[PDB]
Amino acid sequence: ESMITSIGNPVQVLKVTETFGTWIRESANKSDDRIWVTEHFSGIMVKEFKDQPSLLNGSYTFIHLPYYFHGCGHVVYNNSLYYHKGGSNTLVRFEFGQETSQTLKLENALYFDRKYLFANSKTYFNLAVDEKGLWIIYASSVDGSSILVAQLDERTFSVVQHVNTTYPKSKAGNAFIARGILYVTDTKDMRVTFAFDLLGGKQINANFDLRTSQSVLAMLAYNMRDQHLYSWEDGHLMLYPVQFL
Ligand SMILES: *[C@@H]1O[C@H](CO)[C@@H](O)[C@H](O)[C@H]1NC(C)=O
Ligand SMILES: *[C@@H]1O[C@H](CO)[C@@H](O)[C@H](O)[C@H]1NC(C)=O
Ligand SMILES: *[C@@H]1O[C@H](CO)[C@@H](O)[C@H](O)[C@H]1NC(C)=O
Ligand SMILES: [Ca+2]
Ligand SMILES: [Ca+2]
Ligand code: NA
């Protein structure tokens, strides 16, 4: 029903020295100013910034996680961080307020040995939230290739539908999900060249430009709160507008 037709010019919010990382805002209807950051491909700490002025000021508080993260594909939904427990096929839900956590295993997902979903960012699992669901993008350990998406029930942190896109990870740079549609970039992370209607179970044509920069892309995520794409590009924290049709 609602497909992206183009991506606007990016805004640079901050530049830092860490080539790879993520920056994340709350996605739910909450009026939350906080920004969460991780750096590098593994660790057990998150930097919490009160708001965007604090981000620009370098003023944060460390959050110690219950399990090490891997990668740059985490997401925040309803005051919980959803992330990949490094070296396992386990995803973690960590509630920021109560500091409790729950775990979910995806048994037929690649998760080690550099058999990545997105090689460009060493991503095994890309967690995402949009208007239509809470999602995990991953790659099949049955065939070593196919991009799969799990639809979760947020109330039980469990999978309710497994979607096989049939698209080979070798052709994917990165991806995001918006209004129920998976969008996958080319291997250079410059254009979106594949899309899939997740709940309808079918591929849909998509071919549109994403960005002109060639800097390495660590993270790419749609936030339904503001309908922007958030990215981390060679240490540059960027936001892009998106145009729907
Ligand atoms: C922003 O950074 C400057 C540089 O040290 C500092 O003086 C100022 O207090 C910071 N703003 C805060 C902490 O709100
Ligand atoms: C969010 O979390 C709160 C507290 O854990 C809970 O009451 C609520 O049902 C959750 N979901 C939404 C959509 O707020
Ligand atoms: C997904 O589809 C591919 C291509 O048809 C197939 O090889 C694979 O077994 C399917 N399921 C999984 C979990 O990969
Ligand atoms: Ca491989
Ligand atoms: Ca190859
Ligand atoms: Na930082």
Ligand code: NA
């Ligand atoms: Na381009």
Ligand code: NA
């Ligand atoms: Na690139």
Ligand code: NA
């Ligand atoms: Na992504």
